Amino acid sequence: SVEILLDRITPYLLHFSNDSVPRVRAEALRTLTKVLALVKEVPRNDINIYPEYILPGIAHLAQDDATIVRLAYAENIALLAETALRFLELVQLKGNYDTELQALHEMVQQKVVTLLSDPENIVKQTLMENGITRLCVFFGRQKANDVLLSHMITFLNDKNDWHLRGAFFDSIVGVAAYVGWQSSSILKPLLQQGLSDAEEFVIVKALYALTCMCQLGLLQKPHVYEFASDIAPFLCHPNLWIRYGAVGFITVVARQISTADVYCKLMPYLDPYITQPIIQIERKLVLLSVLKEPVSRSIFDYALRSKDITSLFRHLHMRQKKRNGSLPDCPPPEDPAIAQLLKKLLSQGMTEEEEDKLLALKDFMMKSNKAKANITCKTELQQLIQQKREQCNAERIAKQMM
Amino acid sequence: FHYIYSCDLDINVQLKIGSLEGKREQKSYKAVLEDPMLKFSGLYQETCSDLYVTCQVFAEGKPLALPVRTSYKAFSTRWNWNEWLKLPVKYPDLPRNAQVALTIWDVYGPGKAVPVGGTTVSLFGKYGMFRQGMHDLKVWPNVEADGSEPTKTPGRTQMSRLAKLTKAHRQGHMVKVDWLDRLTFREIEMINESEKRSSNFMYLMVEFRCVKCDDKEYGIVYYEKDELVKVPDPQMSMENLVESKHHKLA
Amino acid sequence: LHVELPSQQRRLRHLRNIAARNIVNRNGHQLLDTYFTLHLCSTEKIYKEFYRSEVIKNSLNPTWRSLDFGIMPDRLDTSVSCFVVKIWGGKENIYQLLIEWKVCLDGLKYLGQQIHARNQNEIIFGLNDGYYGAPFQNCVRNSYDVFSLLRLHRAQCAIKQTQVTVQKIGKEIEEKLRLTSTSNELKKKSECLQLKILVLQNE
Amino acid sequence: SRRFIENLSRRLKVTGDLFDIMSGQTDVDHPLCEECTDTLLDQLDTQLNVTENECQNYKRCLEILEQMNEDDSEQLQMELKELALEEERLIQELEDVEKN
Numbered sequence: 001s002v003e004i005l006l007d008r009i010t011p012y013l014l015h016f017s018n019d020s021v022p023r024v025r026a027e028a029l030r031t032l033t034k035v036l037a038l039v040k041e042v043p044r045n046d047i048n049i050y051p052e053y054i055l056p057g058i059a060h061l062a063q064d065d066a067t068i069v070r071l072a073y074a075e076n077i078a079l080l081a082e083t084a085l086r087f088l089e090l091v092q093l094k095g096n097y098d099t100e101l102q103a104l105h106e107m108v109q110q111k112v113v114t115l116l117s118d119p120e121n122i123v124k125q126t127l128m129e130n131g132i133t134r135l136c137v138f139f140g141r142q143k144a145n146d147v148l149l150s151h152m153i154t155f156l157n158d159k160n161d162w163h164l165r166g167a168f169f170d171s172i173v174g175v176a177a178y179v180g181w182q183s184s185s186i187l188k189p190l191l192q193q194g195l196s197d198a199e200e201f202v203i204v205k206a207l208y209a210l211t212c213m214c215q216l217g218l219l220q221k222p223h224v225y226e227f228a229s230d231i232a233p234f235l236c237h238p239n240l241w242i243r244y245g246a247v248g249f250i251t252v253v254a255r256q257i258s259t260a261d262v263y264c265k266l267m268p269y270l271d272p273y274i275t276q277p278i279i280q281i282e283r284k285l286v287l288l289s290v291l292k293e294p295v296s297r298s299i300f301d302y303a304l305r306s307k308d309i310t311s312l313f314r315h316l317h318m319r320q321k322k323r324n325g326s327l328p329d330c331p332p333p334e335d336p337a338i339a340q341l342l343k344k345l346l347s348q349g350m351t352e353e354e355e356d357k358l359l360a361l362k363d364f365m366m367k368s369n370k371a372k373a374n375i376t377c378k379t380e381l382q383q384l385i386q387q388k389r390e391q392c393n394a395e396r397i398a399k400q401m402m
Numbered sequence: 403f404h405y406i407y408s409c410d411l412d413i414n415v416q417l418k419i420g421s422l423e424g425k426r427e428q429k430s431y432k433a434v435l436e437d438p439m440l441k442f443s444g445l446y447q448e449t450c451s452d453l454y455v456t457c458q459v460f461a462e463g464k465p466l467a468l469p470v471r472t473s474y475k476a477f478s479t480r481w482n483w484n485e486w487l488k489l490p491v492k493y494p495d496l497p498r499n500a501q502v503a504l505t506i507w508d509v510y511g512p513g514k515a516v517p518v519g520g521t522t523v524s525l526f527g528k529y530g531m532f533r534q535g536m537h538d539l540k541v542w543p544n545v546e547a548d549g550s551e552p553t554k555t556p557g558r559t560q561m562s563r564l565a566k567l568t569k570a571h572r573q574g575h576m577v578k579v580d581w582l583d584r585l586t587f588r589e590i591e592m593i594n595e596s597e598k599r600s601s602n603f604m605y606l607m608v609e610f611r612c613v614k615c616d617d618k619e620y621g622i623v624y625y626e627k628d629e630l631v632k633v634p635d636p637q638m639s640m641e642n643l644v645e646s647k648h649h650k651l652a
Numbered sequence: 653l654h655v656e657l658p659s660q661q662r663r664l665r666h667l668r669n670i671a672a673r674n675i676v677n678r679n680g681h682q683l684l685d686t687y688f689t690l691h692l693c694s695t696e697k698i699y700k701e702f703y704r705s706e707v708i709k710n711s712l713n714p715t716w717r718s719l720d721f722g723i724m725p726d727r728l729d730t731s732v733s734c735f736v737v738k739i740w741g742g743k744e745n746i747y748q749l750l751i752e753w754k755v756c757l758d759g760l761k762y763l764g765q766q767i768h769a770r771n772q773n774e775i776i777f778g779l780n781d782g783y784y785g786a787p788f789q790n791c792v793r794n795s796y797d798v799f800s801l802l803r804l805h806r807a808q809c810a811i812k813q814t815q816v817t818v819q820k821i822g823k824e825i826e827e828k829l830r831l832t833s834t835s836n837e838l839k840k841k842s843e844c845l846q847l848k849i850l851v852l853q854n855e
Numbered sequence: 856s857r858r859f860i861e862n863l864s865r866r867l868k869v870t871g872d873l874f875d876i877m878s879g880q881t882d883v884d885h886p887l888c889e890e891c892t893d894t895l896l897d898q899l900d901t902q903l904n905v906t907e908n909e910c911q912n913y914k915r916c917l918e919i920l921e922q923m924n925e926d927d928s929e930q931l932q933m934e935l936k937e938l939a940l941e942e943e944r945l946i947q948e949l950e951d952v953e954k955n
Contacts, residue, residue: 011647022495045651053651068495071467086710093681097673097713098767122490125468141718162473180720200474201454208513239474240444240452240509248512260825264916280840284512288442289847297476376498377625380530384623387529388403395575402577431855431949438851659871659886661878731879752857759860773856786860796892804892807899808881814906821913828920838931845938852945 002039006046009035014057022066029061029069033076037083042090050084051100055107062114070123074115078131081108081138108138109147116151124155125167133174145179149186156190159375162199169194169205173212181218188223195230196367198375200239207231207245211252221257225265228253233360235273238297247287254281272360295357299350302341303358309369311338313362316355323352406616407625408532411493415525416611419455419472422481422506424541424604426518444508445518450477453518455606456505457487459525460549461497493532498624500525503547504539504606520547521606523557532622534610541604561597564590654762654781662757662779664722665730669778670705671715672739673769675750684741686714690722691736692729693754698736702728715767718778733757737775751775760784 013035016028036054058080061073084104088097112135115127132152136144152175155168176183194206210227213219219227227249234246250270254262262281273292280286306312315333322330333339350358358365426445434440444451458469467490472483489502501524510516521539526532539557548555568590570576571583598605612618654660670688677684686708689701703723705716722728739751753775765782777784796804874885883895 007644007647011643015643023497045648049651053647066495067490067492089683089711089713092712093683096768122467129468163471178717180718201471211513239476240447244442244509244512251512258822258826259829260822260913260916263825263829263920264912278843279836280843285438285847286843288512289850297478301476377530380498381623381625384529384531385403391570391573391575395570398577431953434851434855435946435949438848441851441854659874661875661884663878665882666884725882731882733879750856753860754858755860786858793888796887796889800889800892800896804883804896804899805877805881807896807903808883811899811903811906814903814910818906818910818913821910821917825913825917825920828917832925835926835928835931838928838935839926842931842934842938845935845942849938849941849945852942852949855949 002041003043003046005035005039006043006049010049010054014054017058017061022064022068025061025064025066025069026072029058029072029076032058033080033083037079039087040090042087042094044094047091047094050087051103051107055080055084059111062111067120067122070115070118070120071126074123074126075130077108077111077115077127078134081135084108105138105140108135109143112138113147113151116148121158121161121164125164128152128167128171132171133178136175136178141179141182144175145183149175149179149183153186153190156193159198159371162197162202165194165197165199165202166205169202169209173209173216173218176213176218177216181220184218184220184223191227192230196364196371198368198372200242204241204245207234207242207249211245211249214249214256215252217256224253224257228266229269230363232269232273233357233364235270235291236294236357237361238294238300243291243294244288247284247291251282251284251287272356292353295354295361296348299345299348299354299358302345302348304365304369306341308335308338309366311335312341313359313366315342317359320355320359403621404619405621405623408493408496408622409625409627411622413614414492415459415489415496417457417487417489417502418609419457419483419485419487419504420536420607420609421483422453422455422519422541422604422606423538423598425602426604427543439511443510443516450479450481451508452477453481453506453508455483456507457489458503458547458549459489459491459496459500460503460522460551461500463550465549466495466500467491493622496525498526498530499551501549501551501553503549504608505547506541506606517544517546519543519604519606520545520555521557522547522549522553522555523608526624530624532610532624534612534621536607536609536612538598538605538607541606543603561594564593653765656762662760663731663733664735664757666780667722667757667777668718668720668780669783670719670737671713671767671776671778672751673713673767673774673776674772675712675739675741676772677712677741682743683710683712685709685743685747686711686739686741687747688716688737688739688751690719691738692732693734693736701738739775755786757784759787761787 010032013028013032017025017032019025019028032054058073061069064070064073081104085101088100088104112127116124118124132148136148139148152168152172155164158164172187176187191206191210194209195203197203197206210219210231214224214227231246231249234242235250237243237246250266254266257266266281267277274287274290275292276290278286278290303309303312311333315338318327319330321327333342428445429440434446440446444453452474454472454474456469456471459466470487470489472485472487475483475485491500501522504521504523505517506519507515508518519541521541523533523537523539537558540559542555545555567576670690672686672688675684675686687705688703689705690703691701692699703719705719708714708716722730734754734756737751737753737755738749740747741750742748751773755775755777757777757779760777761784763776763783763785767776767778767783769776769785771786771788774786877883877885887895
């Protein structure tokens with residue numbers, strides 16, 4: 001029964017969280033979380049157990065030395081707080097409700113903020129992997145917009161761990177939806193920055209986040225058109241994952257906006273990268289089966305890695321000018337290194353169309369280049385040593401006999 | 403024989419993803435006929451696909467931490483990652499039956515991934531020792547690496563005979579001769595190559611941290627640091643935790 | 653923080669919050685899931701709903717998400733000073749109705765930036781400056797001149813006229829594409845056939 | 856449950872009623888200081904520019920549509936039949952290859 005649990009089991013689980021073995025601490029926290037979710041009634045003595053016994057009791061696990069304890073707390077914080085709120089409702093059927101709610105909100109907010117700024121990155125990633133948008137109810141719109149989002153935007157600064165940036169791009173959608181549009185202007189430059197990241201899976205995750213936010217209607221109209229104009233070049237990226245994420249985002253946008261908007265804005269953007277005109281844009285297949293060939297990886301990596309990228313693009317655009325009739329002739333480059341590098345690239349068979357695709361991708365290339373440059377024990381050992389001794393005995397006997 | 407206990411060694415367990423060596427089976431024409439998405443799948447592309455191998459440590463059938471991906475690396479003619487993944491778990495936090503699942507992935511369509519294999523190799527092998535060297539795990543096809551105990555996708559099962567003997571040679575337990583073993587070792591290399599070639603399944607190679615900051619000579623071993631009165635009483639003198647709980651509350 | 657002098661417009665556009673307090677559950681003491689819907693008001697009709705909050709499970713004092721601009725500036729006449737609040741309550745996807753208020757925002761009393769209720773079956777609103785409940789020389793500046801106000805009004809009128817013309821042209825272009833839609837069915841069939849033929853050729 | 860919820864003075868009342876009427880007719884909340892008015896005027900001018908630009912773009916698109924015509928159904932039907940025949944023959948060829 002509920003009273004049996006509360007009286008006899010919980011005060012012993014809380015004592016197992018203060019144990020030496022980290023695994024014992026994690027298991028104690030998991031069992032404590034599981035047991036408390038069984039309760040469906042509030043005995044008179046357990047009216048205010050949460051804000052005075054359990055939450056203060058397990059507070060120390062947010063700063064434990066071992067990372068397993070911190071991972072356990074980060075995984076079980078979302079469920080513990082939600083059980084606290086439901087617990088207060090039960091007591092109501094039995095201090096103003098609003099003041100207690102505010103106190104619980106403050107506790108949850110403080111603990112979330114403490115977890116989001118821990119030295120390790122696995123703790124931070126886990127906090128966002130299991131209820132970062134759920135605790136967004138314990139913050140509020142303004143507090144989330146000024147505290148939760150501000151702490152999540154400093155993850156994109158870390159230039160030595162792309163897992164954390166990927167996690168941010170994965171989990172930003174829920175927080176953006178909860179905080180509303182008052183945060184739209186904040187996340188536009190961050191989404192633009194992600195699409196020019198050194199690691200390409202981060203670009204994939206950013207494209208997925210853009211698609212998701214565009215489906216829910218969280219993007220302004222001009223921002224949608226700007227992102228469509230910036231992502232169209234990716235339909236000819238050598239990498240395949242990005243070349244498909246771009247298609248997904250473009251199909252989603254073509255579905256969201258009206259027919260006139262699609263025919264006025266999206267199609268003019270998509271004209272260079274589709275071999276033939278299309279009609280069923282919202283259908284993914286009718287878009288994939290029409291795209292042109294990508295830029296072969298060899299030329300792409302030779303052009304991106306080579307230093308003095310600006311001069312390379314300058315001369316490439318000069319050659320494009322000559323090819324388009326803009327200028328009567330294309331003069332030779334000033335720098336012999338640029339000439340030699342152009343010869344090397346042209347020896348790989350880079351086609352004029354490949355030059356056009358390189359130029360269209362120029363903005364992504366330069367920003368990516370600069371960013372990249374800056375970047376069970378005793379018996380087991382007894383058996384082992386017995387095996388060692390047997391092997392050594394056989395060894396010595398055999399060698400002496402030899 | 404020198405060794406360091408798992409409990410004392412406080413660093414992050416590291417694993418190297420080598421090369422997925424094998425042949426990948428394809429479907430018939432009717433499969434692509436009914437589901438056109440297979441044409442744009444990764445497997446149906448002429449060149450080797452840009453697969454990425456996730457990894458997650460399990461224990462008692464329970465996931466122990468988040469999976470770890472492999473940094474993007476382009477492939478032209480072979481699958482050669484040669485990357486040193488860093489695992490979220492540390493040596494003192496690995497239970498005895500810990501086992502590392504490793505799943506391969508490939509594109510199937512816009513915003514979808516499809517497993518192209520799965521392998522599961524125990525970390526602490528026989529005699530409670532951390533597996534080292536360069537182990538070539540097996541690859542179960544079209545099944546995500548299963549972490550349940552006992553595993554349904556195990557990694558490692560006259561080739562077996564030579565596997566044991568080679569170990570005894572380099573642990574000092576064998577007769578000493580130079581030319582004979584110089585030729586016999588190439589013989590075993592060819593035999594292993596033939597055995598791998600015959601097998602229909604794939605085979606994902608992998609290496610542990612045989613060389614670390616400390617001397618390579620050391621090895622890791624599972625370890626941890628835990629008639630007046632007749633009728634037993636195991637809590638005769640302790641704290642009344644229920645009394646404390648009631649006292650604190652009101 | 654609400655200066656209580658008049659001329660302070662208090663319309664639905666300044667309202668972004670809603671909550672309920674001390675809802676009485678007729679079927680025992682069970683806690684009930686809840687979600688509200690807001691309606692336009694009229695002497696002859698109580699129009700359909702134009703909002704629907706997410707379901708708050710296991711609660712009798714819900715605090716729903718903030719409703720920015722009511723339902724956002726999407727053809728919502730956010731200048732209406734009167735509206736109706738309905739609250740649905742129940743369990744397991746079967747829901748009843750328990751509250752029905754016809755509220756004119758002007759008549760609402762002011763409480764200080766903190767939700768507080770004392771009567772059963774109550775609703776507490778939230779505007780820009782705080783929360784409102786049911787009734788149980790050196791700082792002066794220069795105001796715009798008439799000429800500037802006329803210019804502002806005229807700018808708004810021009811904006812709206814151009815927007816209306818834009819909507820007209822959009823409907824016209826959609827209509828022109830609509831006639832071709834009949835041939836677009838055959839074109840879609842041809843596209844599907846060509847895609848399948850390409851797949852078959854490659855295989 | 857249900858619930859429900861002298862010249863100087865004349866000129867001040869006239870101004871107040873005018874402000875209330877304007878606030879009810881539009882979405883701007885009167886009255887307004889001159890800095891607020893200036894910012895609002897700049898924003899309105901920018902919005903008018905954007906709206907007129909969009910209207911011109913829509914006019915251009917309607918022109919390009921006006922230049923176009925509507926395709927014939929007979930040719931599309933012929934192409935559809937041709938594609939169907941191609942698909943059938945390709946299927947037969949694929950089955951033959953599989954058997955071989």
